[PDB]
């Protein structure tokens, strides 16, 4: 069978009613995969070989007991067929170090969803710089004077840290200086400004893309909808780049007809769309994984 | 002429007697390049285009006044032929974000020394996992129990943070637990252990590699020496990988016949080797840059 | 009845088999006090008046359910007769701010165990500077050069942060510099050095003092013992100062015949001594509280 | 003569045109005091005795060279007659530890301006809780829900951290939640809210009080003015408490007829008032110090 590993934040603390990682584990188990649970602290590197302490895992939709460990072992990660990296943000240096550990197992034949080097290349907020055609006006800077000028030009902007804490600075806001100071840590940290998009009142849509192919229903933040014509247009333009970079399960954040963020670490909204619509997103994912496992 | 940009820690605070970045700027100026000075805070990104505020720079070996700005401008980074990224460690998330800014200029034709994606791929302590043949016994972990066992097996080890603060834990040291606790931040951060190498008493050599080719004299930490036979062997084995990854100016740290670290951000020791030996390392670098600029 | 309030770290996470705060709540309940539970976040200040959101609490030695809330209210803290400040270390600025909130209730007649201003005056590591006669050789400094010289003079020393992480630097340790660097954060933070006391092998005794009077049995760290002659001597010398400073429940840490630390925030070891010996430490505490409540 | 010590942030970085500490050193030198310079890192504690490395200092109004050291020594702080604690905020735990070091010298007869225990008792933002009659509506809390309700009741409020970064949240501001989240660090840190005072447009006055006596001219933030009738009223009400707490040189911040903050660490504005008006504030301070030195 396929031996599936998952690296994630502690399973004992999720909400199985909405957790997408758990929805993935149930599908994988329904297909008969052997599942191996691990957290960040379980991964290590010894003389260049990637290894982990895993626990063989069993999961079930039981609100009183949704997982159990039926075994425990130390193995080279190269023994697993596929590892799902499902660690939540922040994207910090520890996340980047775990990426090098997963890449040593990847050189030995393991499929990593998503690809380690692409996780380092494709920042969730800065990767939109590669698709400026699709995005709002975006400025990334440490300088208060540039943030002041962007606010003068656009009148109503969003200020966000790169690593929610979104400030909206409308015309007549008294705090642009304090906010710039706070997010740039007095000019020592980069932050991002975008023009505010009023279409947010119509929904912050979450579109999922499975191996480059958009799932046909999205979740407008919480109401499931079919993709509109402009949703299909954004997703078809990014899709090919996600497939070739090995970004196999991606979330795109779309407000109106603007692409605002690209989630490549732990995209969610599977349960919410699946409940209202006849699509098995977890099934599409595992079909795509299995396809990749036979392509090599 | 070539327009050379440099991103570095503030020039007003260096020691021009030993600073290698300054030694590079003097050579570039001696060849007639137009030099453009910038710090991290000068770089920004607007709708996917990389730009910076630069200052045209003039440098001279004058201990009372070694640089002056003769102009100031805002330009797209794609207007510069080559940018030297010479920012010091730490390798943190800000360093990683600046890397994406330099890579947007790189897609537009600018040569970046060293290549942005390789700066993200090649951690200075963890890239040695790709050359385990050349390195000491190395363990990377968050677990105190694994560090305890490595210390039992090797009797005398080095503990270092990934991001100097090197602890030597010899036989009979009472602090392995406190030290593991301190470097792993009670098991939440990865750290690195290696077996101690007694050949350190003979020197921590600094070998420089310019576009894959080892400079023939190194600095044993501070005494300049010709490369020994095993120094040539280590450097010839890494060299090709550095060239193809676009890691054009690299420092390797060698203790005895063991490779311990790979400096790809801001390697130094140019002045120290150049003073005692008939080699112009800065000249080798600029010849290599100019070669790369005509190869495309 | 007496209305007793307690400020503490979350009750849902303690171990009722050894927690001394819980042992205090059971005694108070056995005497019929009305108990009011609060955490740090429940305390606030409005126009100089101290107030809190409390929960009326019920406790019982049940490992499956040891507490329940039977009510909830917002009141001025001046309505409670006595508040036990049982927040764990660190002693940080938040701890210091909560102290000013408790002191506004104290001006209005509430007894605070221990007294707020004394919690600010009496640091657990630095208050020993007032009893140098009883302590080991102690140096507090940010300077590596002074720590090096103390180590030269004493050969075997203890290095500790002021805010466990105790380093022992014996003769021949290779790390004094790295350790000084780490605890002083490269000379920006004070740390403490003391000469090592070999009598630690015979026990790190925990003596409790209730309103200036030593409890006659201590816990040598884990074995309960009667106080020795030198334990009685140390405790009788500190005792009067603790009583007049309103430090009503204190822990003293004694190694051999040396006083090393003074716990004034959350002293423990009640359950361990009480189990093996015929003393009710919680009863001595509540008798002392009740005495203080009738003395005014 | 009097031997005056000063603990301050590095003298090599001040602006002698406006620095009040420097204005104090010039007056002290004009009276013939022997001046001893020290920074935080110079202070230490050995077996309960407070000591420091001092440098004998000479100062002069020379923009190219305003100070020189004419000697260097290690002494017990009890040898100095008076130490001026002139360390800038933040009020952090290091500031609190230095306070215990200065208090050990104070027990041995040294006058400390301002008194160490009062520096711990009198927080610059929270000490206003003792004079609620004079202050605006003030709430101190970690709870977003209480900050939301204060904003509903007052329509236009100020949010500030306890340890500038003042947020004004007017009617219709979209960010109260993000700001509360940012200043309380998601409910783990206390912050302060006050109702906004429109009289700020007429000036944020800085009144100085020397040993309980108000200096008769203030600086409205930058225009020097005589104290108004309500300025005299606020200062006469606080004054006696400052004198008896040994808070010898204090700054009060007054907006309109409201007391907003009490500066007890490093009050300034001496040069600005002294230039426009016939008062020697430094002379009033040294007369008060000399009076205190003969009162014991």
Curated annotation (Swiss-Prot), chains A, B, C, D:
GO terms for molecular function: ATP binding; glutathione synthase activity; identical protein binding; magnesium ion binding. Changing residue 218 to A: No loss of activity. Residues 125-290 form the ATP-grasp domain. Changing residue 191 to A: No loss of activity. It catalyses: gamma-L-glutamyl-L-cysteine + glycine + ATP = glutathione + ADP + phosphate + H(+). ATP binds at residues 151-203. Inhibited by 7,8-dihydrofolate, methotrexate and trimethoprim. Pathway: Sulfur metabolism; glutathione biosynthesis; glutathione from L-cysteine and L-glutamate: step 2/2. The keyword Lipid metabolism does not apply. Pfam families: GSH-S_ATP (PF02955), GSH-S_N (PF02951). Keywords: ATP-binding, Glutathione biosynthesis, Ligase, Magnesium, Manganese, Metal-binding, Nucleotide-binding. InterPro entries: ATP-grasp, ATP_grasp_subdomain_1, Glut_synth_pro, GSHS_ATP-bd, GSHS_N, PreATP-grasp_dom_sf. One of its GO terms (cellular component) is cytoplasm. Its EC number is 6.3.2.3. One of its GO terms (biological process) is glutathione biosynthetic process. Mg(2+) binds at residues 261, 263. Its cofactor is Mg(2+); Mn(2+). Binds 1 Mg(2+) or Mn(2+) ion per subunit. Homotetramer. Belongs to the prokaryotic GSH synthase family. This is Glutathione synthetase.
